[PDB]
Structure 1
Amino acid sequence: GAPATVTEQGEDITSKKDRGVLKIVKRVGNGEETPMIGDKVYVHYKGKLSNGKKFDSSHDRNEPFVFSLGKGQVIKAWDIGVATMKKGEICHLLCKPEYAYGSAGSLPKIPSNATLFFEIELLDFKG
C-alpha cells in the first residue's frame, strides 16, 4: 500500500540524511515557490499508524489544519515536509519516530516508537 511504497520508494528530505522523513510527490503543485518560516499554512491531511489505523483526517472534519511553519507547532517531519511543498501539491510523508512523537508517543492515538504515514495537500500559504 501507500505506506509501504513511500517507505521503499521515497526520497530522504532530511538535512541529516538519516532517512527519518521520506517523501513522494503525488501531485505537482504550482510554480516553484514553497512556504517560508512563519507563514500561515493551510493543509488537508490523513494520518495512519504502522498498524494500519487511520488516526486522523482533516477531510473528515470539513476544515483544513492551519499552523505557522517552522515554529515547532507540529512534529518535526511536518515542519520539514511542508516546507518542501508547492501550493496545490499533494505528497506522502513517512515519518520515523525521531521526527514525530518519539518514545513518548501521544495518548490516546499514537504509540511509543511509532512510524507515521501522512498524505498532505498544501492548500495555501500566506505571510
Structure 2
Amino acid sequence: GAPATVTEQGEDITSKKDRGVLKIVKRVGNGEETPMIGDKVYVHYKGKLSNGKKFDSSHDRNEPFVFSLGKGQVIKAWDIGVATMKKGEICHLLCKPEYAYGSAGSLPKIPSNATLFFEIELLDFKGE
C-alpha cells in the first residue's frame, strides 16, 4: 500500500540525510515557490499508524490544519516536509519517530516509537 511504497520508494528530505523523513510527490503543485518560515500554511491531511489505523484527518473534520511554518507548532517532519511543497501539491511523507512523537508518543492516539504515514495537500500559504 501507500505506506510501504513511500517507505521503499521515497526520497530523504532531511538535512541530516538520516532517512528520517521520506517523501513522494503525488501531485505537482503550482510554480516554483515554497512557503517561508513564519508563513501561515493551510493543509489538508490524513495520518496513519504502522498498524493501519487512521489516527487523524482534516477531511473528516471539514476544516484544514493551520500553522505557522518552521516554528515547532507541528512535528518536525511536517515543518521539514511542508517547507518542500508548492501550493496545490499533494505529497506522502513517511516519518520516523525522531521526526514525530518519539518515545513519548501522544495519547490517546499515537504509541511510543511510532513511524507515521501522512498524505498532505498544501492548500495555501501567506505571510502575516
Q: TM-score, normalised by structure 1?
A: 1.00
Query: Aligned with 2:38: secondary structure?
Result: coil
Q: Which runs of 5+ in 2 are unaligned?
A: none
Provide the rounded CA distance (Å) in 2 between the counterparts of 1:99 and 1:115: 9
Residue by residue, what CA displacement relative to the aligned partner does 1:22-63 show, whole Å, maximum 9, x if unpaired? Answer: 000000000000000000000000000000000010000100
| 2:98 maps to 1:95 | no
Query: Aligned with 2:29: secondary structure?
Result: coil
Match of 1:86 in 2: 86
Match of 1:38 in 2: 38
RMSD: 0.2
Provide the rounded CA distance (Å) in 2 between the counterparts of 1:90 and 1:32: 14
Q: Which runs of 5+ in 1 are unaligned?
A: none
Provide the rounded CA distance (Å) in 1 between the counterparts of 2:66 and 2:2: 24
Provide the rounded CA distance (Å) in 2 between the counterparts of 1:66 and 1:58: 10
Match of 2:74 in 1: 74
Provide the rounded CA distance (Å) in 1 between the counterparts of 2:118 and 2:22: 10
Query: Aligned with 2:34: secondary structure?
Result: coil
Query: Aligned with 1:63: secondary structure?
Result: coil
Deviation at 1:65, TM superposition (A): 0.4
Q: Percent of pairs identical after alignment?
A: 100
Provide the rounded CA distance (Å) in 1 between the counterparts of 2:123 and 2:82: 11
Deviation at 1:109, TM superposition (A): 0.2
Q: How many residues align?
A: 127
Q: TM-score, normalised by structure 2?
A: 0.99
Deviation at 1:114, TM superposition (A): 0.1
Query: Aligned with 2:23: secondary structure?
Result: strand
Deviation at 1:104, TM superposition (A): 0.3
Match of 1:118 in 2: 118
Deviation at 1:66, TM superposition (A): 0.1
